[PDB]
Amino acid sequence: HPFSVKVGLAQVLRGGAIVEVSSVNQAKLAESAGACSVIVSDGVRRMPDPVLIKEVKRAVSVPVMARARVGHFVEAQILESLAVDYIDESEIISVADDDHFINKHNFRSPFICGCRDTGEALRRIREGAAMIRIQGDLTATGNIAETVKNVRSLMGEVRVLNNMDDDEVFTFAKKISAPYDLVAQTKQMGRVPVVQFASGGITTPADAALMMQLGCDGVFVGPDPFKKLRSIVQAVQHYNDPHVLAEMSSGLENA
Amino acid sequence: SPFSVKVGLAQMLRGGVIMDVVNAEQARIAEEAGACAVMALEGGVARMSDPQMIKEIKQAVTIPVMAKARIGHFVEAQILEAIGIDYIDESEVLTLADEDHHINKHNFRIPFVCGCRNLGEALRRIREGAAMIRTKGEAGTGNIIEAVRHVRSVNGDIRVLRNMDDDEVFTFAKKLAAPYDLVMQTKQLGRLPVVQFAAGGVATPADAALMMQLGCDGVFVGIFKSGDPARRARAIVQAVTHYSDPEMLVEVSCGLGEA
Amino acid sequence: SPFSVKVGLAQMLRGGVIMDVVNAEQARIAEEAGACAVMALERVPADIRAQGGVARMSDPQMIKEIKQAVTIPVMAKARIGHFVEAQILEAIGIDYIDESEVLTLADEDHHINKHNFRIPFVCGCRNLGEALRRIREGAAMIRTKGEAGTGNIIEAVRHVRSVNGDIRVLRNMDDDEVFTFAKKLAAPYDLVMQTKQLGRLPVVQFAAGGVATPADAALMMQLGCDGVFVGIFKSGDPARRARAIVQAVTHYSDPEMLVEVSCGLGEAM
Amino acid sequence: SPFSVKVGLAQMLRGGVIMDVVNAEQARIAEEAGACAVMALEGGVARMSDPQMIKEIKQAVTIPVMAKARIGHFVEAQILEAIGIDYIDESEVLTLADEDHHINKHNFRIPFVCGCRNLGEALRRIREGAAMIRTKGEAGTGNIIEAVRHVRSVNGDIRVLRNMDDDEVFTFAKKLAAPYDLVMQTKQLGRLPVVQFAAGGVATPADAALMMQLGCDGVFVGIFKSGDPARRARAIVQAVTHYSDPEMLVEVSCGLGEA
Amino acid sequence: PFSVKVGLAQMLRGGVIMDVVNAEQARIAEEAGACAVMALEGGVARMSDPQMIKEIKQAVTIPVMAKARIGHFVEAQILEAIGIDYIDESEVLTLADEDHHINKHNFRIPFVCGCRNLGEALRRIREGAAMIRTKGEAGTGNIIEAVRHVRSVNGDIRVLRNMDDDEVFTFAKKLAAPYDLVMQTKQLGRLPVVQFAAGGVATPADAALMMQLGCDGVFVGIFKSGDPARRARAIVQAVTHYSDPEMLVEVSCGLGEA
């Protein structure tokens, strides 16, 4: 399926960190530190200027993502035209449609969408999201609390579903306002049918490793960047190695 | 597919009238008046009827025999299926056995009828396996006002769905809290994916014809509560067959007696 | 432990139908129909509800008589918290004591300390926390109760699904989250983990409340219970009915048999 | 001290059962069944009983005779004291005569029994002169649930008080709204400074033994409301004396009749 | 292994644990007689930089503690791999998991956990806390809340000690605490682990008051004063001689601005 293909594309990002960058300079640093991809961003917050996105794409060889406003299917048409690798329909910038998200099945470019619980995730996937970011705080709070909450909520509901009496799954789907067939699939896989990255408030190597130990596939990250970024990449790569995590965190500078 | 077949079985009831019966006598009077199928049943807790009386009814008439099971009472269903009933009515007019879950109807070979009050609820019942939808108003009042409300509700939303922008159907599915697949499938067909009858309050020929004129594939009647049941039954049956023929509707409603 | 033994003693009841009785004749009709045990009391729950007054432990006399009429185990109800009604039942030589919430609550804040007894206890519950608390108090057997003396099985279904639902949630739960789960349940952490590992209640679990027909009883078994209570004599023909329910529990996964035993059973309550 | 003496008088009732009586007959049946003392009394306003019937009862039995006075009705008390009653029960089961004040019991030579629902209330009654406390549950229901609540309440707080930090007892006294002297005196003794019985709902031998096992020095019974009063009375009396003997409790509860 | 961690904590009884944000202080703290130091360094507050933790673990000879955000089991994994003696899962740092605390049994090093009442203490212990600190207000210099919580815990413990055994089941429910630990606590007549006081302990009098209430020691966050070295020693002496008013007068005498 074309969806299976998109879901297959995002799967190459597993085990990685995605870094938000605002220039060719930041993009280059992020690549050097081993970021699996960069997500381009430039009051109302909108899709970034295509010129900036082009410069970033040329400056690096890792996949390039860019944001579109929720429900702004034209911005998404534009991003797909200039040939980005992924589009993030991102609640971090200003929502353009309060009631409807982008009909992501109409695009060839794979989409990431945010979520705070299992029902949300599945709704985004039914709309055609190939990847999900389980999101905490929207601002740069450097606080991972809400992210942990929403990762545990998603992971926890999946575990409840896994073992659930089959007869009760219909009502369960209703309660979380999710498409039944996707709930059924998630039950079978004992996992959400797409790549799932933690995002929001990730500030330290310990934060990033925590997300991985909670079961995520990777993380998004928003006075020494090169070092900090390398530390987080290493953290995600060796999230089960406390000795490595220790080295990574040593004198990283002010977070 | 097994489900598609069950759906097909229920289509042989279109344009028909289903009548409640409590004895073999009534069942014959019902078949004699031209009922498409009969529904076997007998305050106080209301449960599935005794298989004894069900067997007697299935042995008196040659038309399809249906029977009620309490909502969520999957074992009652199993028992009805094992005695060779043609249809099972997981009906809310019986005493609810399970408050949060309905019977998983797919796990059965016999087709199910479920009730509903709106589109979302109809689609949820269908996703659970229901092969035939009963849009129910008020039970045991003889007042069709609620049935009209629900029929208009379901058919109203179906028409809204037909012409809706495809990018808005996802949100619509959420608002209905219904399975997206079935919502789109309903959008395509431009109608309910299964047979749809009306039930509740139908007390006169005019009531029955009104349901058909609204869009219902048929009606349930709960008759012998009238003055001359045999007469009233035939009138309603004719009403359903000739629902767009006033001259006829006048002819069968004339001197019907106490309704 | 002496608690391990009491728990064992109850295992013999798995697959059984316990019946309420108000005299000998009935107790005999209950065993004659194949009841795994009888529960002696001077009023059935339906009559308790319809009548009122204060429902207490039954007079020993009527308990001794019943216990001499049948060979299957004999149970008796003791008001919740009334540890002296219990002592009296223990002394009388009954098999099990049901600290029953269908009788008139005697202590609003504290259940009987059941460990202080050598005789096994059955306690009612409505959810998992309530069951694990009763067990920690000593209860060797648990019956998840719906509504009593109505003939409506809906609340029993709610509670069964409630207890079994959380048990399944508990089994697959992240180990680090069980502590919080125990708090929310308001149940002892030890028993919660013992329930997690085992994948079920660490004691025998029966259904009770509104079980009127064979289909009802079989439903409880298919939901995952170990047996049912019936509070049968408020129906048309007790014997035929009692036998049918017993058979239903033994053949709960057999619709053909269920149809057989349900046919012409008479008028239910 | 006069109070200490009154307290001493009430200690000769320990381990006993007090029975309500309305005629000389009942009083004898009560004494015959081994009652420690008898309580004389006869909708509608409930007042002190006629001295005539009280005199007849005090002349039929050789055990102590008690009588009720309405709460706050100090003149009723005076009248009971003047006719040589052994104990006065300022009882809430009679129609309250004064809503804000109780009888000043010190002003009497006869010992008083007062009711209570918690420790603070018991201590307030004692400070007013009460020589014996009745922890009362529900009156005239045959349901002991409320008595259990109150007994556990009083005894619960007494145990909390026993081990409490001395610097926190002042605040505790305030929360109870009870006299500090008596609170400390209760702390020391580790129990109530006066005799404590249970009352309300006691309908069976088991009920009575339960009260004793909880900590009560005895019980009141309100018997003739049973099938065979003489039998039920003796059973309860034996229950109180052998409250920790199940074998006996079974022996006296057997074939007791309608309770 | 849990009973071993508990024992490792009982060592600290009668001691003063002092906060520190660098080596100098850690020494100024050990030189005053602290039984251990607590390493740290608006805005999110997290675990401290290992480097600074190593600089302190190698600058003193008394046990070295460190804070880990509540629920942040990886911050703890890092602290453990650093080789410090105690981990304090502390609510003064920015809460990391609002719903669950760290599973502390999954660690070798002993854990300190804060609490405000007996149920809260017993839950932390069941999660594997080897030591409990009853916390009042943090960084206010006011001990009112600490007094409240100390009296709260010690109060219910005394209630539990003499309680009717039959009623304990319901008591455990109301506390929302594990029955086993409740009955344990009832048998011991105290917390089954070391219990310190923390929050608003500014003066020597405060420290002695906590001991007289029945605490095993105190935390201090001394450095917010006009003369640290003097203040630290006084507080240490106060905890050691918490019954000697004549002594408490000396150590409180001209200690500068608090």
Tab-separated table of N, CA and C in Angstrom, chain A residues 22 42 46 51 75 92 94 128 211:
chain	number	residue	atom	x	y	z
A	22	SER	N	16.949	26.542	12.443
A	22	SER	CA	16.400	27.784	11.893
A	22	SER	C	17.346	28.456	10.896
A	42	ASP	N	11.326	28.862	10.902
A	42	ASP	CA	11.908	30.190	10.713
A	42	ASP	C	12.510	30.723	12.010
A	46	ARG	N	3.933	30.333	11.116
A	46	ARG	CA	3.478	29.717	9.876
A	46	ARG	C	4.512	28.773	9.292
A	51	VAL	N	12.576	29.452	0.661
A	51	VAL	CA	13.999	29.718	0.432
A	51	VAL	C	14.847	29.092	1.535
A	75	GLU	N	-0.279	24.915	2.557
A	75	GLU	CA	1.090	24.909	3.061
A	75	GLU	C	1.701	23.526	2.840
A	92	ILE	N	2.535	23.136	17.225
A	92	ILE	CA	3.440	24.098	17.837
A	92	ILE	C	3.306	25.465	17.171
A	94	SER	N	0.731	28.031	14.699
A	94	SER	CA	-0.650	28.463	14.910
A	94	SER	C	-1.651	27.656	14.087
A	128	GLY	N	-4.216	9.666	7.862
A	128	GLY	CA	-3.080	9.342	7.012
A	128	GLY	C	-1.718	9.722	7.566
A	211	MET	N	12.793	8.834	27.727
A	211	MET	CA	11.753	8.628	26.722
A	211	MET	C	11.928	7.280	26.035
